[PDB]
Scaffold this active site. Structure first.
Site, short mmCIF file in Angstrom:
data_model
loop_
_atom_site.label_atom_id
_atom_site.label_comp_id
_atom_site.label_asym_id
_atom_site.label_seq_id
_atom_site.Cartn_x
_atom_site.Cartn_y
_atom_site.Cartn_z
N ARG A 1 27.56 65.35 34.64
CA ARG A 1 28.53 64.51 33.96
C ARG A 1 28.13 63.09 33.54
O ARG A 1 28.94 62.38 32.96
CB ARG A 1 29.86 64.51 34.73
CG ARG A 1 30.38 65.92 35.01
CD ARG A 1 31.79 65.95 35.60
NE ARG A 1 32.08 64.84 36.50
CZ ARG A 1 32.60 64.96 37.72
NH1 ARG A 1 32.88 66.15 38.22
NH2 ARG A 1 32.89 63.88 38.42
N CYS B 1 30.84 69.80 38.16
CA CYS B 1 29.62 69.55 37.39
C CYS B 1 28.88 68.27 37.78
O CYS B 1 29.46 67.19 37.80
CB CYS B 1 29.94 69.53 35.90
SG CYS B 1 28.57 69.03 34.82
N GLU C 1 19.64 76.28 40.19
CA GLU C 1 20.52 77.32 39.66
C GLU C 1 19.76 78.64 39.57
O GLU C 1 20.26 79.70 39.98
CB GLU C 1 21.05 76.96 38.27
CG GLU C 1 22.04 75.79 38.23
CD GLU C 1 22.54 75.48 36.81
OE1 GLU C 1 23.33 76.29 36.25
OE2 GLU C 1 22.16 74.42 36.26
#
Ligand code: HEM
Ligand code: HEM
Ligand SMILES: C[C@H](O)[C@H](O)[C@H]1CNc2nc(N)[nH]c(=O)c2N1
Ligand SMILES: C[C@H](O)[C@H](O)[C@H]1CNc2nc(N)[nH]c(=O)c2N1
Lengths: 414, 414
Positions: A115, A112, A289
């Site tokens: 974070r 990830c 994404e």
């Protein structure tokens, strides 16, 4: 004997034999779902001798956190948990402990990039939950809260922990909101090709196939051990963004859109020996994404072909770098559309820079930062990003968010 | 104690301590120059007991190759080498064996995408070489041959193998042709910032600093064990491509260009126990090497800032994805300029597709293909490429091209 290698593009599988002739010096880094990142089923509880140390360690972690430790309570909790462990077998975490657990597990998620937001997380305590319908309500509360009408909020809703291993609460969906994929009559494929098998599953459990390109799939929930109860998500809860380019007015003619909530459903939270096989969490999207993976992957919506055509590029000449041109425009479409409709999102550049800042904070703070380069480097403009030039060590700590075996493969049918 | 982690962008170094708290399940994949990929110096020859099996294995590899094996010669060579090994210590390879060795070592290079061309390689036998000047001549013959006036040809020139370890032939340059980098008076940096330290070295050995942005560095050669003799490369041999965009006529005003020959100099060829610390090889460029890394890296020419400005993009707004736009245009400039001036080059897309084809051939053939995802996936448009979705195992076979400790750190000064 040999190692299985899969190509997530063509779905093709290969068996590597050569690795045996290796040197007396075989990184599995390229592997998507390695066993070392998964936490499977059970049949018996967690043996006390294992559970105990993990528990103590965790409690030591927690209490070793806060400035000026509550030594007495530390000792007391240690003692209280040890007791509770021998009395019940398993044990229960203080709310403030879970909060800490969920944030650390995120903080320990090597794949990830978001974070740096690890400390800004909302936790929904659904450990007292006991029915599917009750899960469904907690989930809706989650989706509602997270969405916040565009101003996305990071949150996680933790369901009951693992007891014996045959009383697991599990969300069968990959992620909370996710479009359906149907293999149509005319040989084609409509919707999200990635959710093909699962859609069929929903169909098999009597789900009504709305046959479109953006049909939000139903929440397939399972409580205790009982079979999965299919629940459809209230459309009022599912916020979406319609794709439109800031210059190519013909882009909206593509009739593209995507959900605003990226919430992982099927993962497992491990902490102090305990494990919660159900605890959906969410952050907010990062442009690539949707623009790169969701829209441009061959196995997904695969829109590169026509976005290129409509742009007038030499789609039959790879060397023209049209794919590089198209994707970029799709990325801006996404970013623009999210920005326009006031829905939280972050481009891959600003994201990477913040992660680099995160590491700096992380190393100086605790002396490390588990990072999976392969996952942290954006699917486009790799080296243009700081993280590409950053060396990193990928390692599993605790607490942690493990993957888990797709529930429909390992389930009871009463 | 702890692991060193470097950021090749800012050059900053970090020490990872956290890895110790890892799980009973730490991939070093992200590391650039790991010890497991390097083959250092020596002081004594290769102990017979090690050298022998490796040698036998190699000879078994070679003879196990050709359709319908020459069993008698196989046995004979095995026997002849064993003999030669006990008589001299080390041993000499039949030319046809080296050819096979160089191609397999390339075939075994996990960080190379051009491996579908593994069988099309030219080998220059310079094992009888004995002086620096003689190296220089072989190198020029190499550069000349490889260049072929644009129609680049893959080739490798193998110098004498390792004897005792203190009689090593070594090219001190990173690659055959490479621009110089000088830290100018006004605080700036001209040329290739990556070749800073090395340039100073050339200067220290009395090299004439031409102080420009594209000054081809001198060949720093060392024969047997004797100190490095500095030789300047004949400008007639150094072919270059001047950068110019097919639409942005202002692009040539940047006064950009780059050499047409990508030839790795400082690597070591290991085969059948033997090791050649000097054996420069070359293929042909892949667009992104120049357009993305060479021109757009912060540590290199770093041209993104102004290519963006000159394009009129919002250079002070990351979310505008200008970097994605600029880089793409630089990539076409490079591809265009190479294509225009009839100099071999391959875009990253067509390259990736051919590699995917390579694996298919490789797995079906020998059952594997050592691949370093981190290195094989293009620095831009990652997922748009097939290799991104391809899972791979990174492992060291034999023969192999190892990295090696920069010679100026471990050298005698007589
Ligand atoms: C706040 C904003 C956040 C951003 C920008 C962010 C972004 C990302 C991105 C880009 C990925 C890769 C997704 C993919 O390729 O499938 C990812 C993965 C991941 N994120 Fe974060 N994330 C955020 C928040 C969170 C939160 C709140 C958690 C958990 C509490 C989390 C846990 C993870 C995990 C475990 C993965 C790995 C998923 C997998 O293995 O499939 N993320 N995130
Ligand atoms: C024929 C065309 C070839 C192409 C398109 C090609 C392309 C590439 C590319 C793109 C890289 C990455 C470079 C970097 O990022 O520094 C690379 C690395 C490499 N290539 Fe290939 N290559 C070719 C031929 C060769 C040949 C002929 C050999 C050897 C006989 C070879 C050996 C290697 C090795 C060992 C590396 C790793 C270099 C390092 O670790 O720094 N390549 N190649
Ligand atoms: C096979 C390969 O590991 C796989 O396609 C990867 C690479 N890196 C990734 N990184 C992110 N962020 N998301 C992904 O799905 C993947 N998939
Ligand atoms: C730190 C990181 O491993 C490094 O920057 C990488 C990544 N992958 C690469 N891949 C290629 N082809 N060339 C490179 O130099 C690098 N460098």
């Amino acid at each position: 004997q040999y190692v299985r290698i899969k190509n997530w593009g063509s779905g093709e599988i290969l068996h590597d034999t050569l690795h045996h002739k290796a040197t007396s010096d075989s990184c599995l880094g390229s592997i998507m779902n390695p066993k070392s990142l998964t936490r499977g089923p059970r049949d018996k509880p967690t043996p006390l001798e294992e559970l105990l140390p993990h528990a103590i360690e965790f409690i030591n972690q927690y209490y070793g956190s806060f400035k000026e430790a509550k030594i007495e309570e530390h000792l007391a909790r240690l003692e209280a948990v040890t007791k509770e462990i021998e009395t019940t077998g398993t044990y229960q975490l203080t709310l403030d402990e879970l909060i800490f657990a969920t944030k650390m597990a995120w903080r320990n998620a090597p794949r990830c990039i978001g974070r740096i937001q690890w400390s800004n997380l909302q936790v929904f305590d659904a450990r007292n939950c006991s029915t599917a319908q009750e899960m469904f309500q907690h989930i809706c509360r989650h989706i509602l809260y997270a969405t916040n009408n565009g101003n996305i909020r990071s949150a996680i809703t933790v369901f009951p922990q693992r007891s014996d291993g045959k009383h697991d609460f599990r969300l069968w969906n990959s992620q909370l909101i996710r479009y359906a994929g149907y293999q149509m009559p005319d040989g084609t494929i409509r919707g999200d090709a990635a959710t093909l098998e699962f859609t069929q599953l929903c169909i098999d459990l009597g789900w009504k196939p709305r046959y479109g390109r953006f049909d939000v799939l139903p929440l397939v929930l399972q409580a205790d051990g009982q079979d999965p109860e299919v629940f459809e998500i209230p459309p009022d809860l599912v916020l979406e963004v319609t794709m439109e380019h800031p210059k190519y007015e013909w882009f909206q003619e593509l009739g593209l859109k995507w959900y605003a909530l990226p919430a992982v459903a099927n993962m497992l939270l491990e902490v102090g020996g305990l494990e919660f096989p159900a605890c959906p969490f969410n952050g907010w999207y990062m442009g690539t994404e949707i623009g790169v993976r969701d829209f441009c992957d061959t196995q997904r919506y695969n829109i590169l072909e026509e976005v290129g055509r409509r742009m007038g590029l030499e789609t039959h000449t790879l060397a023209s770098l049209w794919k590089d041109r198209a994707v970029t425009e799709i990325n801006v479409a996404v970013l623009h559309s999210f920005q326009k409709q006031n829905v939280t999102i972050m481009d891959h550049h600003t994201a990477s820079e913040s992660f680099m800042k995160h590491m700096q904070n992380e190393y100086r703070a605790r002396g490390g930062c588990p990072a999976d380069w392969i996952w942290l480097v954006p699917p486009v403009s790799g080296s243009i990003t700081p993280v590409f030039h950053q060396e990193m060590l990928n390692y599993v700590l605790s607490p942690f968010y493990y993957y888990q075996i797709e529930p429909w493969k390992t389930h009871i049918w009463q």
